[PDB]
Predict the 3D structure of the following.
Amino acid sequence: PTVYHERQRLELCAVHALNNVLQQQLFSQEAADEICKRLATGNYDVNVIMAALQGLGLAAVWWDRRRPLSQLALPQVLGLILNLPSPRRRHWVALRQVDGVYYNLDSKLRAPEALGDEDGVRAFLAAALAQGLCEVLLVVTKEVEEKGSWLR
Amino acid sequence: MQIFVKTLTGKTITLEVEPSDTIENVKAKIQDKEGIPPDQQRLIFAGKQLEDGRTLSDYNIQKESTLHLVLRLRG
């Protein structure tokens, strides 16, 4: 007699993080799967996210955890896609400014969590990085990527 | 000498290296330019994945060679 174990369906966090950072229901599981084909379930890697943004003329810059957060020119960034641990297991999370207020748009939240201005989200990132196992991706336009104007 | 690192997004990274540089040193130089941590990098040359502790000369990776970069981060 083996062990019966029902599991939850995947969270699709990569799709929700893409859509939340763009403030629009643009991507789906079908779009993610289609992208994952040409690069060779529901646990999409950072290659899929990069390719998804690239198809829209955008780009994901990988933030060097060694740099001080003061060197991050947040106003030049469309939004942030984080990779945080989930008590291993990891999940993707979007951080995004709307009308000057930054929000933690974690798809596991019931409502967006307001972080405040650049200082507030900078403290959030510093607290997320100090916890360990946190990767910060910058969602920027192709122009901002070429110029490196995400780096202050 | 110069070697090229090609990513899945079509980007090409140019690096200055020595034959005695380890693959970890190459990943460290990729981190300096791209911010990608070494433990998230998978470097492949001629269809084989490269080992961190080995050197560039061990794999006969010469000047102007083209390495491929695959990222591991999943979520």
Notes: Residues 1-152 of chain A form one domain. The radius of gyration of chain A is 16 Å.
